[PDB]
Design a protein that fits this description.
- Two copies of one chain form a homodimer.
- By secondary structure, the first copy, chain A, is mostly beta strands.
- In chain A, strands 2, 3, 4, 5, 6, 7 and 8 form a seven-stranded mixed β-sheet that branches.
- The first copy, chain A, contains one helix and nine strands, in the order ββββββββαβ.
- Chain A has one domain: Acid Proteases (Cathepsin D, subunit A, domain 1, Beta Barrel).
- Chain A is globular and about 40 Å long.
- Chains A and B meet through β1, β5, β6 and β9 of A and β1, β5, β6 and β9 of B.
- Bound molecules: the ligand CC[C@H](C)CN(C[C@@H](O)[C@H](Cc1ccccc1)NC(=O)O[C@H]1CO[C@H]2OCC[C@H]21)S(=O)(=O)c1ccc([C@@H](C)O)cc1.
- Ligand NE7 sits at the interface of chains B and A.
- Chains A, B: It holds the Pfam family RVP.
- Chains A, B: It is found in: Host endosome, Host multivesicular body; Virion membrane.
- Chains A, B: It is a lipid-anchor.
- Chains A, B: One of its GO terms (molecular function) is aspartic-type endopeptidase activity.
């Protein structure tokens, strides 16, 4: 698929048995999702952007399906205002920028 | 060009006659550069990111060349963690996501 950028590049993802809308975000190294109560062990982390840092929980080897494309990797969970698919998973679905 | 995402999508930009490095950021509506001197008038603005809101200087109709492609548009200047090129200019250079 080709996604133009006139509007936010939001897509449906599937994670932890839930469907959600998330940004395909080339500016994010890693993936950050809204607060959700996933099972398993996690590690605390702090991640920073415009405005400062938020506290998140780092979960490893999480399965996530992005527009029907399967991926597995680290997902950070916390009080982000938007679900953010970062490069750690975008590479796994073969996503490129083109101009 | 086609840019893969196993590394940060950093490119050279020219703005105000000066070269800088910036991140192509599909998760950003707007283009935000770290503190710099730019000619012309500006307006105070607020913008929100993952960690809260910051005060920026809004420069409108600014010439900026991104990886050899010209844009003219709004550039916000303020305490962003890194220089980001957002959708307002990515659309101008014809950038799409593809997978
Ligand atoms: C430092 C480089 C970037 C700033 C990094 N960010 C990605 C970036 O796309 C964010 C996404 C975003 C965030 C909040 C609300 C909308 C969109 N957009 C953003 O701040 O855009 C500004 C400018 O335009 C406006 O529209 C949207 C907001 C305004 S991040 O989220 O802070 C981030 C930090 C660390 C990690 C670790 C896990 O890797 C992962 C992500």
């Amino acid at each position: 698929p080709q996604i133009t950028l006139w509007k936010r590049p939001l897509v449906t993802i599937k994670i932890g048995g839930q469907l959600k809308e998330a940004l395909l975000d080339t500016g994010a190294d890693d993936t950050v999702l809204e607060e959700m109560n996933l099972p398993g062990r996690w590690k605390p982390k702090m991640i920073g952007g415009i405005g400062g840092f938020i506290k998140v929980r780092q979960y490893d080897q999480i399965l996530i399906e992005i527009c029907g494309h399967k991926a597995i990797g680290t997902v950070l969970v916390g009080p982000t205002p938007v679900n953010i698919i970062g490069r750690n998973l975008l590479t796994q679905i073969g996503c490129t920028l083109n101009f």
